[PDB]
Design an enzyme around this catalytic site. Sequence first.
Site, PDB file in Angstrom:
ATOM      1  N   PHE A 285      14.825  50.012  -3.239  1.00 30.45           N
ATOM      2  CA  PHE A 285      13.985  49.657  -2.103  1.00 30.45           C
ATOM      3  C   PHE A 285      12.789  50.585  -1.918  1.00 30.45           C
ATOM      4  CE2 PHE A 285      17.600  52.183  -0.584  1.00 30.45           C
ATOM      5  CZ  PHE A 285      16.951  53.247   0.007  1.00 30.45           C
TER       6      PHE A 285
ATOM      7  N   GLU B 283       9.921  52.836  13.675  1.00 37.08           N
ATOM      8  CA  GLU B 283      10.600  53.773  14.566  1.00 37.08           C
ATOM      9  C   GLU B 283      11.804  54.404  13.857  1.00 37.08           C
ATOM     10  OE1 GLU B 283      11.358  52.263  18.505  1.00 37.08           O
ATOM     11  OE2 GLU B 283       9.214  52.186  18.965  1.00 37.08           O
TER      12      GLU B 283
ATOM     13  N   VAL C  72      15.542  55.785  13.948  1.00 39.29           N
ATOM     14  CA  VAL C  72      16.800  55.578  14.660  1.00 39.29           C
ATOM     15  C   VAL C  72      17.780  56.659  14.188  1.00 39.29           C
ATOM     16  CG1 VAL C  72      18.626  53.902  15.199  1.00 39.29           C
ATOM     17  CG2 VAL C  72      16.287  53.095  14.713  1.00 39.29           C
TER      18      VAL C  72
ATOM     19  N   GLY D  43      20.902  57.673  14.852  1.00 38.51           N
ATOM     20  CA  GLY D  43      22.353  57.562  14.800  1.00 38.51           C
ATOM     21  C   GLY D  43      22.963  57.251  13.445  1.00 38.51           C
TER      22      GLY D  43
ATOM     23  N   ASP E 231      19.588  39.720   3.609  1.00 39.62           N
ATOM     24  CA  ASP E 231      20.085  41.029   3.164  1.00 39.62           C
ATOM     25  C   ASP E 231      21.059  41.664   4.175  1.00 39.62           C
ATOM     26  OD1 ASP E 231      20.402  42.910   1.102  1.00 39.62           O
ATOM     27  OD2 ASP E 231      18.651  44.086   1.667  1.00 39.62           O
TER      28      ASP E 231
ATOM     29  N   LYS F 163      24.128  43.486   5.456  1.00 36.65           N
ATOM     30  CA  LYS F 163      25.149  44.401   4.949  1.00 36.65           C
ATOM     31  C   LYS F 163      25.184  45.625   5.873  1.00 36.65           C
ATOM     32  CE  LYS F 163      21.875  46.378   1.535  1.00 36.65           C
ATOM     33  NZ  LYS F 163      21.708  46.686   0.079  1.00 36.65           N
TER      34      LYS F 163
ATOM     35  N   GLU G 204      24.821  48.778   5.465  1.00 40.48           N
ATOM     36  CA  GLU G 204      23.797  49.793   5.220  1.00 40.48           C
ATOM     37  C   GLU G 204      22.483  49.499   5.945  1.00 40.48           C
ATOM     38  OE1 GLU G 204      25.741  48.283   2.877  1.00 40.48           O
ATOM     39  OE2 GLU G 204      26.321  49.707   1.317  1.00 40.48           O
ATOM     40  N   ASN G 205      22.220  48.235   6.278  1.00 37.11           N
ATOM     41  CA  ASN G 205      20.958  47.834   6.886  1.00 37.11           C
ATOM     42  C   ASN G 205      21.015  47.768   8.406  1.00 37.11           C
ATOM     43  OD1 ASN G 205      19.584  47.741   4.470  1.00 37.11           O
ATOM     44  ND2 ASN G 205      19.633  45.498   4.251  1.00 37.11           N
TER      45      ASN G 205
ATOM     46  N   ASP H 225      15.021  46.899   7.076  1.00 36.09           N
ATOM     47  CA  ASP H 225      14.837  46.375   5.720  1.00 36.09           C
ATOM     48  C   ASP H 225      14.661  44.857   5.669  1.00 36.09           C
ATOM     49  OD1 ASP H 225      14.486  45.957   3.026  1.00 36.09           O
ATOM     50  OD2 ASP H 225      16.147  47.162   2.364  1.00 36.09           O
TER      51      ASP H 225
ATOM     52  N   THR I 178      22.752  41.405  -2.065  1.00 40.04           N
ATOM     53  CA  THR I 178      23.718  42.337  -2.619  1.00 40.04           C
ATOM     54  C   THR I 178      25.009  41.596  -2.986  1.00 40.04           C
ATOM     55  OG1 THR I 178      22.755  44.008  -1.148  1.00 40.04           O
ATOM     56  CG2 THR I 178      24.874  44.537  -2.155  1.00 40.04           C
TER      57      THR I 178
END
Length: 339
Positions: free
Chosen positions: A43, A110, A112, A114, A155, A157, A159-160, A173, A190
């Site tokens: 990416f 922005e 994030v 967390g 996309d 998942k 992770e996003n 993403d 994925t």
Amino acid sequence: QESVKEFLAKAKEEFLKKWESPSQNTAQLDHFDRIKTLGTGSFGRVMLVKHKETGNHYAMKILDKQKVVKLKQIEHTLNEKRILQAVNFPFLVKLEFSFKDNSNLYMVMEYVPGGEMFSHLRRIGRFSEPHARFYAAQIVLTFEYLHSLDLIYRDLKPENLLIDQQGYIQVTDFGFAKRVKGRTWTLCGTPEYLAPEIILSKGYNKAVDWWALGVLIYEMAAGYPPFFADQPIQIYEKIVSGKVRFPSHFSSDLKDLLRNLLQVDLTKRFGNLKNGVNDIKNHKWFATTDWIAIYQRKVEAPFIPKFKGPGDTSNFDDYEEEEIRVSINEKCGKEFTEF
Ligand SMILES: O=C(c1ccccc1)N1CCN2C(=O)OC[C@H]2C1
């Protein structure tokens, strides 16, 4: 209800105005200080940066133009920036600036702090059903918004999905997102999250996002995805087969919802029937969900990530730190004219 219909009509009006006249060239690289690499790979790179005049922190996505061309991602990169500058929703990360130079394309989002849902899921093991349902409700509303603009996300998942200072989701993403009236054909996504019709090289539609929601809900509540295998070819054989196994701790309502989202026949899949998203929102698994209170961010979240302030990087991991080089000559100017 008429209130939902009028909200979506206004949402589409505002999207189309920005879609037809995109913003361009709203910052430059030497307006920022570089802090830390937050992610790298197919990416591109994502870097924590600080604006030198305001002091605000941002997540800057950097794409190498020459590599985008070689990996055949030109149209996808143009999709990502044009969509992000035009959308507006509580559970989507906001694009603040975009620009390009001799070597790279930049999207300044922005920050994030967390971290990714993926990290928290693997740390705890699995989420309780109430905790999984809180996140799932936010994805349902986000897809209702995107699909009403004729956009497919493609996309989904863990992770996003980033977790913010209030414990709510922000989706990042948009590299595979696309405006589609009818069908589209590109192989992307994925492996564990792909719908059967993508694997079979068919023309597909927004129903692929509702399949992916089934995979996400299963993974949040079990701790692992439903079609897991060691190699992609083995994953694909499991996906097309039309069989799944549920852990005994799953409730009967959860199993019933998942059988209807993980439906191999796209003409029978929840989200893609005559009643659209309402077959999902009205399902028994969501009986405790206050859809309006979720949208308005009035529900107390299941947990707040631990972090010290808006510049803390402790919830992301460590990568080798590489240069941001800019050539003295312009590369691939024609291909990225519209960016
Ligand atoms: O942009 C980000 C990010 C990365 C770091 C910080 C904030 C945001 N992503 C998360 C990791 N990612 C994948 O696993 O694939 C897509 C990509 C998206």
